[PDB]
Amino acid sequence: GMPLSCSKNNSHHYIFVGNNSGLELTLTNTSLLNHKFCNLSDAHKRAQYDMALMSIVSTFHLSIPNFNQYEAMSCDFNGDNITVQYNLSHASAVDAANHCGTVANGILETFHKFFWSNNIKDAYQLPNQGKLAHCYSTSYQFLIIQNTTWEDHCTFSRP
Numbered sequence: 001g002m003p004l005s006c007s008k009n010n011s012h013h014y015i016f017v018g019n020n021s022g023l024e025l026t027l028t029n030t031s032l033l034n035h036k037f038c039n040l041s042d043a044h045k046r047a048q049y050d051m052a053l054m055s056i057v058s059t060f061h062l063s064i065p066n067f068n069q070y071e072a073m074s075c076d077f078n079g080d081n082i083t084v085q086y087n088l089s090h091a092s093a094v095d096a097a098n099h100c101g102t103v104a105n106g107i108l109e110t111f112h113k114f115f116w117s118n119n120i121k122d123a124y125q126l127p128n129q130g131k132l133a134h135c136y137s138t139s140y141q142f143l144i145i146q147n148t149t150w151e152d153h154c155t156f157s158r159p
């Protein structure tokens with residue numbers, strides 16, 4: 001709730017979505033959510049989760065393959081502010097290949113091609129019926145997504 005997103009040990013970028021708000025995406029070795037769950041019970045939590053998911057897919061023009069692969073993820077809600085944390089399993093090349101068809105991998109792809117992090121590397125390529133999948137490796141342990149403003153985008157929000 002107090003640590004900085006724009007820390008030197010982190011790779012960060014902020015994107016605008018609308019209604020004078022956006023998303024702050026952080027690649028960090030510091031965790032923000034400690035429960036291993038993501039409620040999504042009521043439609044409000046689901047709508048706010050879908051709104052953030054579709055914003056990243058539309059903005060980054062992503063196409064996530066279906067490899068039946070799962071990226072460990074927990075979410076939290078504090079009012080209208082959503083927090084999504086991915087516990088990244090992309091340390092090695094085989095780790096990236098076993099987690100290639102996930103949204104977090106697609107975000108690592110976006111961080112790589114626009115050079116928002118010099119740690120990410122294209123470690124594996126997987127052919128399929130869709131576009132050739134690129135699996136990216138990174139030493140970062142966590143990928144954090146938060147709905148915040150341009151004024152406060154360098155500071156983590158309190159979930």
Ligand SMILES: *[C@@H]1O[C@H](CO)[C@@H](O)[C@H](O)[C@H]1NC(C)=O
Binds near residue numbers: 033034036087
């Ligand atoms: C992610 O990692 C944090 C810190 O190690 C842990 O508290 C949390 O339960 C983990 N979440 C999932 C979904 O594994």
Ligand SMILES: *[C@@H]1O[C@H](CO)[C@@H](O)[C@H](O)[C@H]1NC(C)=O
Binds near residue numbers: 017021048052081082
């Ligand atoms: C972020 O929260 C505001 C309310 O504070 C809401 O109006 C906006 O739709 C949210 N943005 C996203 C992408 O969820």
Ligand SMILES: *[C@@H]1O[C@H](CO)[C@@H](O)[C@H](O)[C@H]1NC(C)=O
Binds near residue numbers: 029139140
């Ligand atoms: C994060 O932790 C991993 C685990 O050893 C390490 O390899 C990596 O260098 C760390 N990244 C940063 C930015 O400290």
Ligand SMILES: *[C@@H]1O[C@H](CO)[C@@H](O)[C@H](O)[C@H]1NC(C)=O
Binds near residue numbers: 078079081147148149
């Ligand atoms: C949600 O985020 C907005 C924008 O960062 C902030 O103004 C508001 O106080 C937050 N809600 C809380 C902290 O309950």
